[PDB]
Amino acid sequence: MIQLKTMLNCIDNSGAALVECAMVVGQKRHASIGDRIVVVVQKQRGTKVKRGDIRHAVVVRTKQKVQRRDGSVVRFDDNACVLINKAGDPIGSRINGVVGQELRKKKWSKILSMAPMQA
């Protein structure tokens, strides 16, 4: 459950390390795995995104428990995302870390193909 002012760990090679959620796009309820958000970059890593940039992102794993049809429930130790463009495709080229398997049913194929492991 991501909302305004929530901090997330960006796990793509876009240049961002810590981003703050500014808007939940396409809905009023708090964002979960597979939802689009607008973020503001607060920390970088050392056409990369710099601190203060405003980009769109996709929640790839949350700390709130996410239930599935088969009764299984997944939970991560952090909230993470990957930056995207208004077109919907990723900005980076490689993702380091596990992502939520809920990205499959929300039409995020490109984010999954570059994801090493899914949970």
């Binding site: 088969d70 299984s72 429930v73 939970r75 130790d77 596990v98 492991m117 949970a119």
Partner: protein, 194 residues
């Protein structure tokens, strides 16, 4: 034709006289189990659920929930191997052990240390924790769901845990970390054995 019945009497207490009486009808004392039915339908859209008809006008079991639970468990686990894997016995899987859950229609079994066993009939579940990379991941799994193709014990706990739930393993002090070590050793012992 007239079904069996008994007479209920209302008496006047100021005169000890019968005010009015009625013939109260009782259900057939001997429950009659009729023969099988001859009604047969030919359609792909519906079926008639007349498999086992009970005796006519008989109170069904008061609490059908425990009876319905054993029907689903016997259906989701015919051999009874999963029900025995998590029973409250010595050979069964205990909290604190390491379990590997194989997924139907999936790859990359999820392995982790068991932190809790919720016994809720057909919704019995186990919580497994692991570290995929540098991120902790906990997972609930309904053992009787068919998406759980298999469950194996790859590493048992030396001493029986002193707690029904081990939620303290979320703390870095008691966090076991990753489990790829026990998974590898388990697979090694498996192929070398056969």
């Amino acid at each position: 034709a007239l079904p069996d019945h008994n007479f209920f009497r209302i008496a006047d207490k100021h005169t000890k006289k019968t005010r009015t009486a009625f013939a109260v009808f009782t259900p057939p004392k001997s429950p009659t189990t009729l023969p099988p039915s001859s009604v047969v339908t030919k359609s792909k859209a519906f079926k008639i659920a007349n498999s086992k008809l009970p005796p006519l006008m008989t109170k069904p079991p008061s609490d059908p929930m425990p009876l319905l639970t054993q029907q689903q468990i016997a259906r989701m686990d015919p051999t009874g191997a999963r029900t025995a894997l998590f029973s409250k016995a010595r050979h069964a899987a205990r909290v604190g052990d390491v379990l590997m859950v194989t997924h139907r229609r999936g790859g990359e079994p999820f392995a982790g240390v068991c932190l809790a066993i919720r016994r809720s009939g057909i919704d019995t579940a186990i919580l497994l924790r692991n570290h995929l990379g540098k991120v902790g991941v906990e997972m609930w799994y309904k053992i009787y769901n068919k998406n759980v193709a298999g469950i194996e014990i790859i590493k048992r706990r030396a001493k029986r845990a002193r707690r029904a739930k081990l939620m303290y393993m979320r703390q870095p002090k008691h966090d076991m970390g990753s489990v790829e070590q026990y998974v590898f050793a388990w697979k090694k012992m498996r192929k070398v054995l056969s």
